Each structure stands twice: as structure tokens, then as C-alpha cells.
């Protein structure tokens, strides 16, 4: 519970970083 | 999106499912093993609840 609650936390900081910095629409093939 | 990815994992957990069908082979293995995960969780829950 000490490690795997930090694994989910690292995956959640990346997932905000992909959501905010990269949109979903214009032209973004192979992007992150 | 991140809404579309999170209520795939919640949608396939409560056996209802969302729209959100993966199309690449790399995401049909994540989705295909989360369906087998939540098949064993629900079947072990409803067998012990008896
Ligand atoms: C109880 C419930 C908990 C579940 C919640 C879990 C998932 C919830 C989060 C889901 C993320 C939302 C994705 C938005 C859809 C993408 C579309 C887009 O790009 O425009 C977005 C831009 O704004 C953003 O970029 C979104 C950033 C949201 C913060 C990142 C998640 C925070 C995680 C913390 C919590 C997670 C911890 C979870 C703990 C369990 C939407 O903007 P708009 O207002 O529609 O206008 C369009 C603007 N535009 C024209 C510039 C594009
Ligand atoms: C029915 C409803 C579900 C149907 C699913 C049926 C599927 C077939 C399932 C199992 C078939 C394999 C036979 C296992 C039985 C023998 C036991 C055995 O050897 O287990 C071995 C492991 O073996 C596994 O763990 C198998 C797990 C496979 C999961 C397949 C998911 C499919 C998702 C598809 C995604 C692709 C998406 C496609 C995208 C295009 C070892 O176990 P053991 O040594 O015997 O005992 C434990 C002792 N020990 C702890 C020391 C190790």
C-alpha cells in the first residue's frame, strides 16, 4: 500500500500533464 | 480523454459498460484484461455474498 498508492499517483500526474498540455483535436498523431 | 478513460474502468467494473471501445491493438489488451479482471471480481463477490 506504500508503493502501489504512489504508482497510481505518478500515473495521475502524467495523465493531467497529457490532458492539459495536449488537446485531442487539431493535428496530433503519435503525440505522447 | 480522461473522463472517457476513467468511466471505461468504472463502466466495465459495474458490468454496464460505456461507449468508448478501443480500436488499436495496444488498447484492446488493456481493455481486454480489465474485462477479465472485473469478471473474476464480480463472480467472486456474488458467490461469497451467497
Ligand atoms: C467522484 C468523481 C471522481 C472521478 C474524477 C476523475 C476524472 C475527472 C477529470 C477528468 C479530466 C477532464 C478531461 C476533459 C476532456 C478533454 C477536452 C478538452 O481538452 O477541453 C477541456 C479543457 O480542460 C482540460 O484540459 C481538462 C483538465 C482537467 C484537469 C485534469 C484532471 C484532474 C484530476 C483530479 C481528479 C482525479 C482523481 C480521481 C479520484 C477518484 C475541457 O474544457 P471545457 O470547459 O469543456 O471547454 C473547452 C475548452 N477548450 C476549447 C480549450 C478545449
Ligand atoms: C470462463 C470465463 C472467462 C473466460 C476466459 C478464458 C481465458 C483462458 C484462461 C486461462 C487458460 C490457461 C489455463 C490455466 C489453467 C491451469 C492452471 C495453470 O497452469 O495456471 C498457471 C497460470 O496460468 C494463468 O494464469 C492463465 C491466465 C490467462 C488469462 C487470459 C485472459 C484473456 C484476456 C484476453 C485479452 C486479449 C484481447 C484481444 C485483443 C485483440 C499457473 O497456475 P498454477 O501453477 O497451476 O497454480 C498456482 C501455483 N503458483 C502460485 C506457485 C503458481
State the gist of this model.
Chain A is mainly α and 32 residues long.
Keywords:
part of a larger assembly, 2 chains, A: 32 residues, mainly alpha, elongated, B: 50 residues, binds ligand POV, Glutamate receptor ionotropic, kainate 2 (chain B)
List the topology elements.
The structure is cut from a larger assembly and holds chains A (32 residues) and B (50 residues).
Chain A (H helix, E strand, L loop, with lengths): L3 H18 L11
Chain B lengths: L1 H8 L17 H22 L2
Bound molecules: the ligand CCCCCCCC/C=C/CCCCCCCC(=O)O[C@@H](COC(=O)CCCCCCCCCCCCCCC)COP(=O)([O-])OCC[N+](C)(C)C (2 copies).
Describe what this molecule looks like in 3D.
- It is classed as membrane protein.
- The entry lists the keywords Kainate receptor, GluK2, Neto2.
- The structure is cut from a larger assembly and holds chains A (32 residues) and B (50 residues).
- By secondary structure, chain A is an all-alpha fold.
- Chain A contains one helix and no strands.
- Chain A has one helix at residues 4-21.
- With 50 residues, chain B is mostly helical.
- The radius of gyration of chain B is 12 Å and the shape is elongated.
- The chains are: A mainly alpha (32), B mainly alpha (50).
- At the A-B interface, helix 1 of A face loops of B.
- The complex binds the ligand CCCCCCCC/C=C/CCCCCCCC(=O)O[C@@H](COC(=O)CCCCCCCCCCCCCCC)COP(=O)([O-])OCC[N+](C)(C)C (2 copies).
- Residues 25, 28-29, 32-33, 36, 39 of chain B line the site of one copy of the ligand CCCCCCCC/C=C\CCCCCCCC(=O)O[C@@H](COC(=O)CCCCCCCCCCCCCCC)COP(=O)([O-])OCC[N+](C)(C)C.
User: What distance separates the N and C termini of chain A?
Assistant: 29 Å
Taken in chain order, the helices and strands of chain A follow as H
Helix-strand makeup class of chain A: mainly alpha
User: What percentage of amino acids of chain B are in beta strands?
Assistant: under 5%
Q: How does the major sheet of chain A shape up?
A: none
Assembly classification: part of a larger assembly
Our count of helices of chain A gives 1
Number of helices of chain B: 2
Which structural class best describes the helix and strand composition of chain B?
A: mainly alpha
Helix-strand sequence of chain B:
HH
DSSP, total strands of chain A: 0
Bound compounds? the ligand CCCCCCCC/C=C/CCCCCCCC(=O)O[C@@H](COC(=O)CCCCCCCCCCCCCCC)COP(=O)([O-])OCC[N+](C)(C)C
Question: Could you tell me the radius of gyration of chain B in angstroms?
Answer: 12 Å
Major sheet of chain B, described briefly? none
Mass-distribution shape of chain B: elongated
Helical fraction of chain A equals: 55-70%
Number of strand segments of chain B: 0
Protein name (chain A): Neuropilin and tolloid-like protein 2
Subunit structure (chain A): Interacts with GRIK2 and GRIK3, but neither with AMPA-nor with NMDA-sensitive glutamate receptors.
Subcellular location (chain A): Membrane
Family (chain B): Belongs to the glutamate-gated ion channel (TC 1.A.10.1) family. GRIK2 subfamily.
Amino acid at each position: 500500500i506504500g508503493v502501489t498508492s504512489g504508482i497510481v499517483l505518478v500515473l495521475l500526474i502524467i495523465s493531467i500533464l497529457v490532458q492539459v498540455k495536449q488537446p485531442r483535436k487539431k493535428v496530433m498523431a503519435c503525440k505522447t | 480523454t480522461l473522463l472517457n478513460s476513467f468511466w471505461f474502468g468504472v463502466g466495465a467494473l459495474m458490468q454496464q459498460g460505456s461507449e468508448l471501445m478501443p480500436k488499436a491493438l495496444s488498447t484492446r489488451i488493456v481493455g481486454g484484461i480489465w474485462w477479465f479482471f472485473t469478471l473474476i471480481i464480480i463472480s467472486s463477490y456474488t458467490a461469497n455474498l451467497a
